[PDB]
Structures are given as structure tokens and as C-alpha cells.
Amino acid sequence: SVPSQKTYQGSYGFRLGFLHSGTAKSVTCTYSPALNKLFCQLAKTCPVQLWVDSTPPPGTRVRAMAIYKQSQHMTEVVRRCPHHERCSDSDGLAPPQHLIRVEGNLRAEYLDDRNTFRHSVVVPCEPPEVGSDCTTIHYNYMCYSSCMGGMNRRPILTIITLEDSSGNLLGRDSFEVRVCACPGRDRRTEEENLR
Ligand SMILES: CCN(CC)C1CCN(Cc2cc(C#CCNc3ccccc3)cc(I)c2O)CC1
Ligand SMILES: [Zn+2]
């Protein structure tokens, strides 16, 4: 089955935000609002902001999951390729098969769904650091979009869901991702292809 990707702010006015990182050749993570698409290098830090209009209950959590974007591929589980799942680049918490990791959060949990077999990573929802207006989660994507036997050039979406302590839906947002060697160049190209 295919998880919903419908944008849903819910009772708390949940939505994502992204930094404005530009498109220099040196950039390692950059987001295109026009394409709703994040471009990043392999295993590099990707800051994603969480914004709400009101404070959700303690015990609320934030889950990230990847799916294939194209209709003819959406039912296939997104996972790391046969090379990367065996490269022993473990952080001690993430299963080596999982494409999406959360960086630097000791309370991250990783799920292999027993019915759909899909992977996800979930962390507790927390208020912003003192002085800040939003909370930032740092994600890593652990295969290239081009990885043979893995994504194999197929575009993916990341779906971020806000959940209660039971796992019930409180909010949802999503963005496309391309993991590539030169995110700046690729963002510029795709934005021009759209123009
Ligand atoms: C207009 C927005 N308005 C500005 C004044 C508010 C600014 C202040 N925010 C607070 C806020 C809270 C949470 C959370 C959580 C769950 N845990 C928890 C823990 C301890 C206690 C309670 C709850 C997430 C975010 I992201 C976040 O911005 C809510 C919105
Ligand atoms: Zn790979």
C-alpha cells in the first residue's frame, strides 16, 4: 500500500520550512520552493524546519518516510542499494537498510513496518531552542538517487508526519528529494527546465 502524501496542517498548523542556501557549486543541501524539491549530497546534513501555530501535546512525534514519486513505482519500498546497505557506515542506531536517518538525536527510533515493510525514522516533537521560532531536524539521505539496485534514478518524496503518542495522524507535509553529487547545479538546471 502507498502512504498518503496529502498536505494536512491539522489542529496545530503544522508545516515544514527550509533554509535559503543558494545554488553555488559548493552547496551541499539546497531547497527549491518552485519545485518543492530538496537537492542534497550523499549523507550530508539536511536541515528541515518544523513550524506550528500552537503547541502540540507532550509525546507528539515527527516521522519521516520515503516513497517513490512516480505512479508506476509508488508501491515499491524505498531502501538503500545492495552496495550501501553493506558499507558499515552505521551510526549505532539506524539499520543499514534505511535511506533516511536523523542525525544527532539519541531519541530517534527506526521502524520496519510489519505489514508494508516500509522504513521510517521518528523523533519526539520538541519546542524550539530559546530564542528560536521553529524546531530543526537534521536528516541524512544515505544513497544517491542514481544508485543501481536502489533508487536507480527514480525520484522520491519524503513524507513528514506529525503524530500523537499512539501514532495517529496530526499533520502531514512532503517534498521531493534528489540525492546527487552537485545539488547546486542540479537545482539550477531543473528550475530552468521548469521556466
Ligand atoms: C504562532 C506560534 N507561537 C508563537 C508565539 C508558538 C511559539 C512556540 N511554539 C512552541 C512549540 C512546541 C512544540 C512542541 C511540542 C511537543 N512537546 C512538548 C514538550 C514540552 C511542553 C509542551 C509540549 C513544537 C514547536 I515547532 C513549537 O514551536 C508553539 C507556537
Ligand atoms: Zn546506494
- CATH number, domain with residue 47: 2.60.40.720
Rounded to 5 degrees, what are φ and ψ at 192?
A: -75, -35
Q: How far is residue 65 CA from its own chain's centroid?
A: 6
Q: How many domains does the chain have?
A: 1
Q: How far is CA 193 from CA 102, 107, 109, 112, 146, in A?
A: 32, 41, 38, 37, 20
Instruction: Give 187 Cα–ligand 1 centroid separation in angstroms.
Output: 32
Which residues are known binding-site members for Zn(2+)?
Answer: 81, 84, 143, 147
Q: Side-chain half-sphere of 85: how many Cα atoms within 13 Å?
A: 14
Q: Are 20 and 34 within 8 A, CB to CB?
A: no
Q: Sign of torsion, CA 178 179 182 184?
A: positive
Residues 6+ apart with CB under 8 A from 48: 16, 17, 18, 136, 137, 138, 139, 160
Residues pairing with 124 in the sheet: 61
Q: Which ligand is nearest to the CA of 15?
A: 1
Measured CA to CA, the distance from residue 111 to residue 169 in angstroms comes to 16
Among 55, 10, 59, CA closest to 172: 10
Gyration radius of the chain over CA positions = 16
What pairs with residue 58 in β-bridges?
A: none
Which residue out of 51, 52, 122, 133 has the highest number of ligand 1 atoms within 8 Å of its CB and is therefore the one to mutate? 52
SS3 string, the chain, reads: CCCCCCCECCCCCCEEECCCCCCCCCCCEEEECCCCEEEECCCCCEEEEEECCCCCCCCCEEEEEEEECCCCCCCCCCCCCCCHHHCCCCCCCCCCCCCEEECCCCCCEEEECCCCCCEEEEEECCCCCCCCCCEEEEEEECCCCCCCCCCCCCCEEEEEEEECCCCCEEEEEEEEEEECCCHHHHHHHHHHHHC
- Residue among 32, 46, 40 nearest 191 (CA): 32
| The three three-digit cell numbers of residue 152, written as one number | 536507480
- d(CA 45, CA 139) in angstroms, rounded, equals 6
Counting Cα atoms < 13 Å in the Cβ hemisphere of 187 gives: 27
The range of the structural domain enclosing residue 108 comes to 1-195
Q: What angle do CA 64, 42, 190 make, to 5 degrees?
A: 85
Query: What is the separation of C-alpha 39 from the centre of its chain, rounded to a whole number of angstroms?
Result: 11
Grid coordinates in use for 90? Answer: 552505521
**Residue 38 class from Cβ within 10 Å (0-12 exposed, 13-18 middle, 19+ buried)?**
buried
Substitution site in 11, 14, 55, 163 for ligand 1 pocket (most atoms within 8 Å of beta carbon): 55
With 0-12 / 13-18 / 19 or more C-beta atoms within 10 angstroms meaning exposed / middle / buried, residue 140 is buried
